[PDB]
Design a protein around this ligand. Structure first.
Ligand code: ZN
Ligand code: ZN
Ligand code: ZN
Lengths: 64, 238, 101, 142, 147, 120, 50, 209, 101, 117
């Protein structure tokens, strides 16, 4: 699987890093280039793919 | 090696709100015989019961008693738990486990899992099985020289294990520390050294070669073993 | 003393060993070559046996040299064969069993 | 951890996924329905005790779309949009998982029944109620 | 089984297996299943009768062939999975009554036990009197022989 | 492996105990035995969480067991009863090292004396 | 030998067979059966030799 | 938990006495052949109660060659030995002018403690032992031949007789159980005497490396 | 056979001799037995070959020197005397020690 | 005691989990995704039979009497109907070491009596 994803805001490949704070059940995805940050709830089954997913979904929902 | 699981018939986690009255009449009577007076603190007690039933057959086979098992529980967990047991003259062997105040039921489940496997009542770890037999071949019999000056073979009991704990076994009381050996040559090297492993490797190779009745001159075996041990460590032929 | 040493070397009762010179067959060959009659007394002085065995033992060397290291190594290298030789070429055996001249 | 968890490995998924998640993704959310598809005699408690760890592993993913979100998440190629991912997962389940059962829509019940049968066979093997299959048996060859 | 023996809807190649201990019936029409013909046994009797042998003796004239045996439900093709559920008599002598019956519930009988051998091993005379590796060696040397 | 799981299990355990234990240990001061205590070494604190009153109750049970044995066998002397009970209690305290094990041992002794009395 | 093996089987079927130390019931039964058959083979071989 | 501990301590003491005697230190025959009853008499019987205490089992012996060469054998009560206790032992060795010591640990010793052990090596030679290792004397096993430490003059004579360099001899590791038992360091040569089924006797030499 | 038949015939006891001839079931069981040995040969060949090559490569340059020591190519002493007795293996014989027992 | 089965919530058909009433000290079975609750009566939330003394007669099914590959005997009649013929077989199941024990099934149709000797 992939842990570094392309940022939906600046389109920089592999510029997004994902941090899984399991103790607080929160995943934080941050772009290194444009410094955009997003926080989502996560479960023990969650992965950086699902944090990256929740971010894309939040973007598309907010852009409606 | 003997864990608790090897001597238990079954387990069960009940919900006994008060030890004064339990869910089984036998257990209630025995406990209230035990619960005559406050030998404890009532506040620091949980209602979650963990009842363990042992096999009289296995315990007798190992000459184990619920006192030793309870002492092992105390050693491995401490006074933070509460283990009580009935007399051995009862119909069944039973012991009850509680905790002094994750959930308590899930915690009891975790304790029961660990108690069955990790906790050891008897024996040495890594030794899974032991066979006891009287040898009929002179290679394992005790050979002595009588006062008349003759070689005499005495039949004696010897034990054969499935694992190897050579250092621990050698230190056990009534175990011969001169003859007790292993077929695992790396353990021999670790415990006894390089000359010992030289000799043991020679013996194992001789056993393998001569099992068929075939014979190879000693100097070839000696040269191989010397080649494998001359540098102070075990040199594999690889 | 050789017997005690052997008891140490072979703590079991296994007397079967692998050694260079088949002494029993050599004694049998000597008996046949020189037409030894076992039923008559021999002319072999028992002291001749002891001295002869000593010289022979001196004559077969695996580690040569006169220093103490060489002497001990030579003693060790031929210890088993020398025990066998002394227990086969005894004066008692030579006199009452092999009857060599 | 404590119990024995059952995990299914699907084609085009590089990580194992709990079986209950697969059943939920097929459209069976309630534990009762999944157990009915897996266990046919509810009076058998031992089988029920043997399946509890699988339910415990997947108790937060109580919705079909979340399960299809999960499976799509475990996939080799990660689509940026969830909609493509749930659809990709829906594609994998409908087309790549158990094709001989069916490859058309509205076949999720047949897939669920066959997966439940597979889990039932696994449970029977685990409980020692059925002998393991022999790979050299010529009836298992073509 | 009746349908397959009559060849109405189920062709002879089809395998039907009932696992009684389990509660499964498995039917296979796939390709690649190895099967062999066997004689069907009723209560304790072969369905193959003297009349079938008489008809086969004149197969040149009456056009009575092996296919007619299969059509009359006297012989059956059995694959390995179905063989797992068959009670097989080695010879019709096994169907005779004994002071102590062994099976008494035979479903099939072998046509002849020598059919277990292949082409090369079928030319060995008295192969049941040899050590098996020698039969194996002949199975290759026969392929190396000159003719 | 097993060693890694044993330490991890211990880590899981101690924190659960801490959750299940008080911030500070409400040490109930050891009750000093009355001068009339017939229990040998009544002032000892060798066995943790064991009260002198529990020892007195156990000695009372031993007294009852010895009385039953005497009446069944018609023992003559009476002073031996108290001395024997005190000696049994002291031996049990000396041997055992945990309260529950101590009580179980005393009950086992009581059962043994009861069986001996039954035998006659 | 065949009758002896039948007797051993009948004993095992009625739970009148006890496992030898270090062996489960099945291993004990197989040991007895193989002992009987090996003894029969040895006896027949000796007769043929004679 | 008490009688077993007493037996363990007695066995460790017996093995230590045998080791000291084999290393050339002065030990009395009674000390070597001390029964368990004599151990319970001279020492305590209830290690849980503190009698005997491990600090009461410390032994001091002097070499036969010269009294000034002395060796300590203390048994720390702490199951695991750290740098601090090593420093205490080093300080008392300084005070008493003792340059050698044996330390018998129950559970083990910390890596930094081992680094300290090797750090002050040239000045003080203090070695480590697990009591599990000392519960039996490995030199008495039938598989272990007789090991004899050679003097420098003997090594020179050997190398001159066989015209060898040190690196041409067979090797024994300094961490070898027998090498640790005899306390031999790198550069020393041990002479091994073993019986042979072909020659009767055979002497081989191993260099410590 | 019937299910759970543990009798000699069921489990592969051939009660016939080669002259009498085997019954079909005995024939098949005997074929299974022989197949076992054929397979064993076919696999042991390669296993043993690799072992042999490794042994040879491990001891190829060890030889007796003119000082009678055994040394490897690096001139390290492997044995101070070959076989601990300094003898070749083709000239020794089995003999019995007369004073051991 | 025996095995303790699982319960399902009446409102959402999900597995119920044991819980206690801190104020009342009684055992309850409460759902997780929902808030449904139920009063227990067994008071035994877990069981683990190490010896595995399970009844193999329960698992046997009477249909096995139709298997032509099973042996049949006329020396162990059944009591339910008195039929003299029966099939017999072994446990052939893991967790059964002394599994050479025979089990019998009556061959009379519509009787299906299983028993052991
Ligand atoms: Zn960005
Ligand atoms: Zn619910
Ligand atoms: Zn009936």
């Amino acid at each position: 699987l992939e842990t570094q994803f392309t940022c939906p805001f600046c389109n920089h490949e592999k510029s997004c890093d994902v941090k899984m704070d399991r103790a607080r059940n929160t995943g934080v995805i941050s772009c290194t280039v444009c410094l955009e940050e997003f926080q989502t709830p996560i479960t023990y089954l969650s992965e950086p793919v699902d944090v990256y997913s929740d971010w894309i979904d939040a973007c598309e929902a907010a852009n409606q | 090696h003997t864990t608790l699981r090897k001597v238990t018939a079954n387990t069960a986690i009940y919900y006994d709100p008060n030890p004064q009255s339990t869910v089984v009449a036998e257990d209630q009577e025995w406990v209230n015989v035990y619960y005559e007076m406050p030998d404890f603190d009532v506040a620091r007690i949980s209602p979650w019961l963990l009842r363990v039933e042992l096999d009289r057959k296995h315990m007798t086979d190992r000459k184990l008693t619920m006192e030793q098992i309870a002492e092992k529980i105390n050693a491995g967990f401490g006074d933070d738990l509460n283990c009580i047991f009935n007399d051995d003259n009862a119909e069944k062997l039973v012991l009850r486990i509680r905790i002094m105040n994750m959930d308590d039921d899930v915690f009891l489940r975790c304790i029961e899992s660990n108690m069955l496997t990790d906790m050891t009542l008897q024996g040495i770890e890594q030794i899974s099985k032991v066979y006891m037999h009287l040898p009929q071949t002179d290679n394992k019999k005790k050979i002595i020289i009588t006062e008349d000056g003759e070689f005499k073979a005495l039949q004696e009991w010897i034990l054969e294990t499935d694992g190897v704990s050579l250092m621990r076994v050698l230190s056990e009381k009534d175990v011969d520390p001169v003859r007790t050996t292993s077929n695992d040559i790396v353990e021999i090297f670790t415990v006894l050294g390089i000359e010992a492993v030289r000799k043991a490797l020679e013996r194992e190779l001789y056993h393998v070669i001569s099992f068929d009745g075939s014979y190879v001159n000693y100097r070839h075996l000696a040269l191989l073993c010397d080649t494998m041990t001359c540098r102070g460590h075990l040199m594999a032929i690889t | 003393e050789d017997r005690e040493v052997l008891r140490v070397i072979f703590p079991t009762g296994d007397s079967k060993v692998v050694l260079p010179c088949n002494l029993l067959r050599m004694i049998w060959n000597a008996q046949k070559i020189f037409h030894i009659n076992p039923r008559l007394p021999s002319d072999l002085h028992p002291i001749k046996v002891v001295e002869g065995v000593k010289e022979l033992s001196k004559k077969l060397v695996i580690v040569n040299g006169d220093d103490p290291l060489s002497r001990q190594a030579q003693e060790n290298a031929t210890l088993l064969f020398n025990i066998h030789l002394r227990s086969t070429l005894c004066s008692r055996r030579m006199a009452e069993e092999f009857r060599l001249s | 951890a404590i119990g024995q968890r059952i995990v299914a490995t699907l084609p085009y998924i590089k990580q194992e996924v709990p079986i209950i998640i697969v059943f939920r993704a097929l459209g069976f959310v309630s534990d009762r329905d999944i157990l009915e598809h897996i266990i046919y005699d509810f009076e058998d408690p031992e089988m029920m005790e043997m399946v509890k760890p699988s339910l415990d592993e997947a108790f937060v993913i109580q919705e079909q779309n979340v399960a299809l979100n999960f499976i799509g998440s475990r996939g080799a190629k990660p689509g940026v949009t969830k909609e493509k991912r749930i659809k990709y997962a829906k594609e994998v389940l409908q087309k790549e998982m158990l094709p001989h059962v069916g490859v058309s829509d509205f076949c999720e019940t047949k897939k669920a029944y066959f997966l439940g049968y597979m889990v039932h066979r696994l449970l029977l093997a685990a409980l020692g109620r059925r002998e393991l299959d022999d790979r050299d048996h010529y009836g298992n060859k073509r | 089984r009746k349908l397959r023996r009559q060849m109405d809807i189920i062709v002879s190649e089809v395998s039907m297996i009932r696992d009684i201990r389990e509660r499964e019936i498995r039917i296979y029409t796939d390709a690649g299943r190895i099967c062999r013909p066997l004689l069907i046994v009723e209560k304790q009797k072969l369905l193959l009768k003297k009349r079938h042998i008489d008809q086969l003796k004149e197969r040149e004239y009456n056009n009575y062939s092996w296919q007619d045996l299969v059509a009359s439900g006297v012989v059956e093709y059995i694959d390995t999975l179905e063989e797992e559920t068959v009670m097989l008599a080695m010879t019709p002598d096994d169907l005779q009554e004994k002071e102590v019956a062994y099976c008494s519930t035979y479903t099939h009988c072998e046509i002849h036990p020598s059919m277990i051998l292949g082409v090369c091993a079928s030319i060995i005379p008295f192969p049941d009197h040899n050590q098996s590796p020698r039969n194996t060696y002949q199975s290759a040397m026969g392929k190396q022989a000159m003719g | 492996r097993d060693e890694a799981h044993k330490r991890e299990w211990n880590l899981f355990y101690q924190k659960q105990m801490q959750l299940r234990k008080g911030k500070d240990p409400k040490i109930e001061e050891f009750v000093p035995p009355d001068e009339n205590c017939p229990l040998k070494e009544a002032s000892s604190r060798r066995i943790p969480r064991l009260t002198v009153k529990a020892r007195e109750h156990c000695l009372r049970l031993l007294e009852e067991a010895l009385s039953s044995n005497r009446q069944s066998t018609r023992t003559a002397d009476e002073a031996d009863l108290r001395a024997k009970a005190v000696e049994l209690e002291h031996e049990t305290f000396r041997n055992a090292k945990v309260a529950n094990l101590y009580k179980a041992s005393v009950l086992k002794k009581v059962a043994d004396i009861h069986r001996a009395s039954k035998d006659g | 030998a065949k009758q002896d093996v039948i007797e051993v089987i009948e004993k095992a079927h009625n739970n009148e067979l006890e496992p030898t130390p270090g062996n489960t019931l099945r291993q004990t039964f197989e040991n007895q059966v193989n002992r009987i058959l090996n003894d029969a083979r040895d006896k027949t071989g000796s007769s043929a030799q004679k | 938990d008490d009688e077993e501990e007493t037996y363990r301590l007695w066995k460790i003491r017996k093995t230590i006495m045998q080791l000291c005697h084999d290393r050339g230190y002065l030990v009395t025959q009674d000390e070597l052949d001390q029964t368990l009853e004599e151990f319970k008499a001279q020492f305590g019987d209830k290690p849980s109660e503190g009698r005997p205490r491990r600090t009461d089992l410390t032994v001091l012996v002097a070499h036969n060659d010269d009294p000034t060469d002395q060796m300590f054998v203390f048994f720390p009560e702490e199951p695991k030995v750290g740098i601090k206790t090593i420093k205490v032992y080093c300080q008392r060795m300084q005070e008493e002018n003792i340059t050698r010591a044996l330390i018998v640990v129950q559970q083990g010793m910390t890596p930094s403690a081992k680094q300290s052990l090797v750090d002050m090596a040239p000045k003080y030679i203090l070695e480590q032992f697990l009591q599990q290792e000392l519960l039996i004397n490995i030199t008495e096993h039938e598989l272990v031949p007789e090991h004899v430490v050679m003097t420098k003059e003997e090594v020179t004579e050997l190398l001159a007789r066989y015209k060898l360099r040190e690196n041409q001899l067979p090797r024994i590791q300094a961490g070898d159980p027998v090498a640790r038992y005899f306390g031999i360091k790198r550069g020393q040569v041990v002479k091994i005497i073993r019986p042979s089924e072909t020659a009767g006797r055979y002497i081989t030499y191993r260099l410590v490396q | 056979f019937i299910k759970d038949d543990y009798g000699p015939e069921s489990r592969g006891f051939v009660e016939n001799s080669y002259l009498a001839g085997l019954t079909p079931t005995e024939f098949f069981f005997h074929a299974m037995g022989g197949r076992e040995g054929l397979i064993d040969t076919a696999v042991k060949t390669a296993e043993t070959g690799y072992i042999q090559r490794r042994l040879i490569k491990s001891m190829e340059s060890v030889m007796v020197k003119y000082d009678a020591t055994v040394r490897n190519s690096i001139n390290q002493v492997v044995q101070l005397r070959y076989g601990e007795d300094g003898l070749a293996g083709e000239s020794v014989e089995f003999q019995n020690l007369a004073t051991l027992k | 005691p025996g095995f303790v089965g699982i319960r399902f919530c009446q409102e959402c058909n999900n597995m119920l989990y044991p819980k206690e009433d801190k104020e009342n000290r009684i055992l309850l079975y409460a759902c997780r995704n929902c808030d449904y609750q139920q009063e227990a009566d067994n008071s035994c939330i877990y069981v683990n039979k190490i010896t595995h003394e399970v009844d193999e007669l329960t698992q046997i099914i009477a249909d096995v009497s139709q298997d032509p590959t099973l042996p049949r005997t006329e020396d162990h009649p059944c009591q339910k109907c008195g039929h003299k013929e029966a099939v017999f077989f072994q446990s052939h199941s893991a967790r059964a070491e002394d599994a050479m024990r025979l089990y019998y099934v009556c061959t009379a149709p519509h009787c299906g009596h299983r028993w052991t000797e």
